[PDB]
Amino acid sequence: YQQKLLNYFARNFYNMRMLALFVAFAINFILLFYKVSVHYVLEESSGYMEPTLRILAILHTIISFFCIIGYYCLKVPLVIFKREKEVARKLEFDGLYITEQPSEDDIKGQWDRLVINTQSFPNNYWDKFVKRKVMDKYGEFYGRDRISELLGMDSAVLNSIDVKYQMWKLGVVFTDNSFLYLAWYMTMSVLGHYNNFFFAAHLLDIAMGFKTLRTILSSVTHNGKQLVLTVGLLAVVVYLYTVVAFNFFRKFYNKSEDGDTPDMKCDDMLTCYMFHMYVGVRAGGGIGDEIEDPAGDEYEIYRIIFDITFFFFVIVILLAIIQGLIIDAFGELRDQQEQVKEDMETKCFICGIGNDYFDTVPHGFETHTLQEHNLANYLFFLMYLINKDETEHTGQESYVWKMYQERCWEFFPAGDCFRKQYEDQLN
Amino acid sequence: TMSVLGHYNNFFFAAHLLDIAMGFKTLRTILSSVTHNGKQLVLTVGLLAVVVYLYTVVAFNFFRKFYNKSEDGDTPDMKCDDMLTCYMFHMYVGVRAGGGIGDEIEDPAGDEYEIYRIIFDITFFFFVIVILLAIIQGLIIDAFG
Amino acid sequence: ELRDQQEQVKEDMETKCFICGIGNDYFDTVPHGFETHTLQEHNLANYL
Amino acid sequence: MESHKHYTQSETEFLLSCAETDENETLDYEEFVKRFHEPAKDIGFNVAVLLTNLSEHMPNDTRLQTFLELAESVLNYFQPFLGRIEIMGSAKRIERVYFEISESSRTQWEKPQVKESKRQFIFDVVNEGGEKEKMELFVNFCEDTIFEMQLAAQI
Ligand SMILES: [Zn+2]
Ligand SMILES: [Zn+2]
């Protein structure tokens, strides 16, 4: 029954994620009717909203817990399988764990060093002959006892489990980004019972919940590296203007209202810098809007050129750069999509001869892509080769399997299709 | 229907000016830029609404005492207490003021939450008045391209 | 303009070799012919 | 059998003649699995593979076209279960390879998640580029998709 329950939880991960999102939306919509006198809820001539928030919060916490269980039971095996495959290939080919011995850097390898000693090291890679292969290839160079020591194979209780492999798996799933995001979701949902306003932070799930919103938000993320540098450049420029203003025009920054008020000014550097960052980049017209004009002063022309240069170098150029980064992001994304479409429509993926050679036959290129060189056909062939005992392999199947084990990929056609090699008319 | 209703009230004939959208070919190319990316414009507006709501929640929880609209001292205290009033205030003022919400609220001159208010205003400005508008113009530019 | 210049440079470097510029289409008859030609036959480092 | 079965002794009477496994004059659960389930599934598949191999390897043969056209029913039934790939043979010549495609895998490849993963893989390959790394990336994607379909088979 537990296995069936876990399979049911895994099968409906996305549906219950959307359910959690809708529940959070409902909680926020109810949250919108607060009022202070302390923080009592006001209802539109009703009294049935008193437990609706509580039951919705309980439902949200339960659904979020089910979401994290389903994610741990469905998407985690992909991460484990990828990590095991990568470490197995590295150990078999490079042999870095016995030759290179990586340093304190590359923490991933150091953490993966804890899985070699485990008995069930290829738990998901379906290739349990990796230890035998590495022994057969390294025994005559690194001995036999050293490799054996390094590998180290020698409903009531169920205590016969490998705790080292479980610890390594728990370590490697904690560093995953999606699991960390789900843990943050758990923390926010749990904290929502202490304070009802903590459920507002769950609205950020719409950033990744909708595909059409990820394309919008990818424009900012595409050039997000340069946006912070632009902000830093703006901060440096504002600081330089602050230094000039403090050194020369310190007497203008006086905020006196209708005469008879105490003289409030900006004397020290920190106050002037906060004034320039808070006002002047915000006023829409630079710093000259909120300072008195130099009507009849010896520094009038200097103040005028200072204001004009500050405006033209902060409010115009920097903002133009900030919008330009987003515009270039949109253009780059569209150009990449167009290039991908053209590359897929102008040559086939496997050998890439080109459609011009296949246009001699009517609809030749479409037939070639759909029958001769098809990605689905290659994937099905690879799966059928994997899920087949070696005793039943034919000559071609054994040949392909041997090159797949050696990982040479000379059997993939490249620049030579069936029509090019075996012409219909003998020549 | 609009032409018939124009006899009951003479101002109902003003709605017939929208026929110029499809009456001229050279205007359809102009109006097709908005329609080309019209699917994403409403999503951008919704994202803006969500961001403004989050800022509203933060302001209500922390800086509720600053939203006081008192004129020349001797006036009754008009404030934004409940969530709905603060949300309407943020959607009506702050996305419209050209400089965020800090223009229409008193500055924290000598307060314990001064730096928090400053970073709140700066983040609201940089995340609503600049980035969202940049996206809105970017959609139209990409449509033209 | 900067992005277009970078894209053009990348395409020009990936579509023909620098020295003689015959083109990758002629070298595609041999499997991985163009990469071998650029890395062994016409290499800028070798000429330098 | 009144849709596509014609009233003839060789076909209509044949099923009734083969329905001698029960003395109670009624059908049973074992009839449709004893026959036409374990045989006539891989036996006919090999015949279809042989016929299509002969047709592909000997084009424009007058005698073979009649054979292909008379046996169109079996080949049409075996269209979804036929795989056609091209590999570089041991004799430096392109050789066609035929195999069997399982029905569950065919269903599992039409899910939107697998199509989205394939589209993302193509996008990443074209963006990053490369030729030697291209086949390694393709094989890695194939292995990941195979593991995902095997995991999703356990519903
Ligand atoms: Zn091809
Ligand atoms: Zn050359």
From Swiss-Prot, chain B:
Identify the domain of life.
Answer: Eukaryota
Intramembrane ranges, chain numbering? 94-103
Membrane-spanning residues: 4-24, 43-63, 124-144
**Protein localization:** Sarcoplasmic reticulum membrane
Question: Result of mutating residue 100 to A?
Answer: Strongly reduced calcium channel activity. Abolishes ryanodine binding
Q: What happens when the gene is disrupted?
A: Embryonically lethal. Embryos die at about 10 dpc, due to defects in heart tube development. Cardiac myotubes display enlarged rough endoplasmic reticulum and cytoplasmic vesicles that contain high levels of Ca(2+).
PTM: Channel activity is modulated by phosphorylation. Phosphorylation is increased in failing heart, leading to calcium leaks and increased cytoplasmic Ca(2+) levels.
> Impact of changing residue 102 to A on the protein?
No effect on calcium channel activity. Abolishes ryanodine binding
Question: What is the annotated tissue distribution of the protein whose record heads this document?
Answer: Highly expressed in heart, lung, cerebellum and brain. Detected at lower levels in adrenal gland, stomach, thymus, esophagus and ovary.
Q: What quaternary structure, including any partners, is listed in this protein's UniProt entry? A: Homotetramer. Can also form heterotetramers with RYR1 and RYR3. Interacts with CALM and S100A1; these interactions regulate channel activity. Identified in a complex composed of RYR2, FKBP1B, PKA catalytic subunit, PRKAR2A, AKAP6, and the protein phosphatases PP2A and PP1. Interacts directly with FKBP1B, PKA, PP1 and PP2A. Interacts with FKBP1A and FKBP1B; these interactions may stabilize the channel in its closed state and prevent Ca(2+) leaks. Interacts with SELENON. Identified in a complex, composed of FSD2, CMYA5 and RYR2.
* Family according to the record: Belongs to the ryanodine receptor (TC 1.A.3.1) family. RYR2 subfamily.
Domain comment in the entry = The calcium release channel activity resides in the C-terminal region while the remaining part of the protein resides in the cytoplasm.
Describe the function of this protein: Cytosolic calcium-activated calcium channel that mediates the release of Ca(2+) from the sarcoplasmic reticulum into the cytosol and thereby plays a key role in triggering cardiac muscle contraction. Aberrant channel activation can lead to cardiac arrhythmia. In cardiac myocytes, calcium release is triggered by increased Ca(2+) cytosolic levels due to activation of the L-type calcium channel CACNA1C. The calcium channel activity is modulated by formation of heterotetramers with RYR3. Required for cellular calcium ion homeostasis. Required for embryonic heart development.
**Protein name (record):** Ryanodine receptor 2
Q: What is the organism of origin for this protein?
A: Mus musculus
Counting on the full-length protein, the chain here runs from 4726 to 4870 of 4966
From Swiss-Prot, chain C:
| Top-level lineage group | Eukaryota
Phenotype of null mutants: Embryonically lethal. Embryos die at about 10 dpc, due to defects in heart tube development. Cardiac myotubes display enlarged rough endoplasmic reticulum and cytoplasmic vesicles that contain high levels of Ca(2+).
Tissue localization of expression is: Highly expressed in heart, lung, cerebellum and brain. Detected at lower levels in adrenal gland, stomach, thymus, esophagus and ovary.
Q: Where in the cell is it found?
A: Sarcoplasmic reticulum membrane
For this chain, the Swiss-Prot or TrEMBL PTM comment says: Channel activity is modulated by phosphorylation. Phosphorylation is increased in failing heart, leading to calcium leaks and increased cytoplasmic Ca(2+) levels.
Family as reported in the entry's similarity comment: Belongs to the ryanodine receptor (TC 1.A.3.1) family. RYR2 subfamily.
Q: How does it assemble?
A: Homotetramer. Can also form heterotetramers with RYR1 and RYR3. Interacts with CALM and S100A1; these interactions regulate channel activity. Identified in a complex composed of RYR2, FKBP1B, PKA catalytic subunit, PRKAR2A, AKAP6, and the protein phosphatases PP2A and PP1. Interacts directly with FKBP1B, PKA, PP1 and PP2A. Interacts with FKBP1A and FKBP1B; these interactions may stabilize the channel in its closed state and prevent Ca(2+) leaks. Interacts with SELENON. Identified in a complex, composed of FSD2, CMYA5 and RYR2.
Domain remarks in the Swiss-Prot or TrEMBL record: The calcium release channel activity resides in the C-terminal region while the remaining part of the protein resides in the cytoplasm.
Q: What does this protein do?
A: Cytosolic calcium-activated calcium channel that mediates the release of Ca(2+) from the sarcoplasmic reticulum into the cytosol and thereby plays a key role in triggering cardiac muscle contraction. Aberrant channel activation can lead to cardiac arrhythmia. In cardiac myocytes, calcium release is triggered by increased Ca(2+) cytosolic levels due to activation of the L-type calcium channel CACNA1C. The calcium channel activity is modulated by formation of heterotetramers with RYR3. Required for cellular calcium ion homeostasis. Required for embryonic heart development.
What name has this protein been given in UniProt?
Answer: Ryanodine receptor 2
Gene name, per UniProt, is: Ryr2
